[PDB]
């Protein structure tokens, strides 16, 4: 029953602030140290702070000593982390974790005993502004069942939703998670495998939809 639930993924321009929350249930947040670590995608863990929710006392490494502001709202069993001056190296999953029991007579603050984790909160950094996608057909191999698809290139922000033949084709459809490019934009692709003899007779269309720029693209794919 001890559970920590973090706020949803976020996105900030470089030079901007982010704030992440961490809701506790199954226990009283202020009875235990809260630790914050972080994990850049495909990188390792970096411990970033501990905070005593009763006193407000908070130690961070020299690295995070002026950028970070930990706070709590124990009325809500919520912990907060605020990180200033974001840059692309600030891009990672931020984890909160529950550490030792808080007591004046025994110090467990710096104990790395994290017996409970949040699921993590992805923060992305990008100087990118809304942008509609460019949709290109992915022609079936001409050799090839047959794989065909759609490339949904250089859009912002998420999500692009995708269907095929207005939903009349679902079997063998695989729409891939978007990659977050260094340019700051997203691309994704959606691929479907179809019987080879269906080419030339069955038309195929991917229905790309990007609400954030109010665009809809129904792209015809062909050999």
């Amino acid at each position: 029953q001890v559970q920590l639930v973090q706020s949803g993924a976020e996105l900030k321009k470089p030079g901007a602030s982010v704030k992440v929350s961490c809701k506790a249930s199954g226990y009283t947040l202020s009875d235990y140290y809260v630790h914050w670590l972080r994990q850049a995608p495909g990188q390792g863990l970096e411990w970033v702070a501990w905070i005593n929710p009763t006193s407000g006392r908070t130690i961070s490494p020299r690295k995070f000593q002026g950028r970070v502001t930990m706070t709590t709202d124990t009325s809500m069993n919520v912990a907060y982390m605020e990180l200033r001056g974001l840059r692309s190296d600030d891009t990672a999953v931020y984890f909160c974790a529950r550490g030792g029991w808080i007591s004046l007579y025994v110090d467990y603050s710096y104990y790395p005993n994290f017996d409970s984790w949040g699921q993590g909160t992805l923060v992305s950094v990008s100087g990118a502004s809304t942008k509609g996608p460019s949709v290109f057909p992915l022609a079936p191999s001409s050799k090839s069942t047959a794989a065909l698809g759609c490339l949904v290139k250089d859009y912002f922000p998420e999500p692009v939703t995708v269907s095929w033949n207005s939903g009349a084709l679902t079997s063998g459809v695989h729409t891939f998670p978007a990659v977050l490019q260094s340019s700051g934009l997203y691309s994704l692709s959606s691929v479907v495998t179809v019987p080879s003899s269906s080419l030339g007779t069955q038309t195929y269309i991917c229905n790309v939809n990007h609400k954030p720029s109010n665009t809809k693209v129904d792209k015809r794919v062909e050999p």
Binding site: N113, L138, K153, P177, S189, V191
Partner: protein, 210 residues
Amino acid sequence: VLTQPASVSGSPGQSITISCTGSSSDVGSYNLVSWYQQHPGKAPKLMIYEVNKWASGVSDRFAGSKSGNTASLTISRLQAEDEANYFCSSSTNSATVIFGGGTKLTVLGQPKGAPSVTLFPPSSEELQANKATLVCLISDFYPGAVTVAWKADSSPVKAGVETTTPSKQSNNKYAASSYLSLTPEQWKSHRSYSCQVTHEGSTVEKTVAP
């Protein structure tokens, strides 16, 4: 950062030792070493705490020791659901926590779940619009760890590459994708480009040409 071996590889039954090297101001000066286990999508999980003590729900497979400034996690009667990451951590004397760089482990007692790879060349409509994107779609692989390499002809290519981290497919296997950005002139002026996905020592390579 505490120093770990970037990678260790093993086999069932037999044992593995993972190392952690710090300083007298952390690992040497306390019995506060903790070993964390983490799998591709999940959050880290506590195995060993305070050097050697067992966390709830952890086998004696895992044991913890310390030699002056070196922490070690010995693992015995090996299984296969490891296949992922081991991070070490120690209190410091500045009242902080320091983590090791992460032993990325690669056990072998499971079969696999080899990746289906699909490589698409730039579309005519894209080249026509003076860009080019090679798309490499990688699916159905388990365990969710992959390295992706691109080559133009026979030689490696590292610029213009964006590659996702592996994320769970709806089958309890994994997917990822990798994009190669090219100038239409680059694309035209090569025998071929290739996407090569490396999984568990094994490699799959898909190749396209203009």
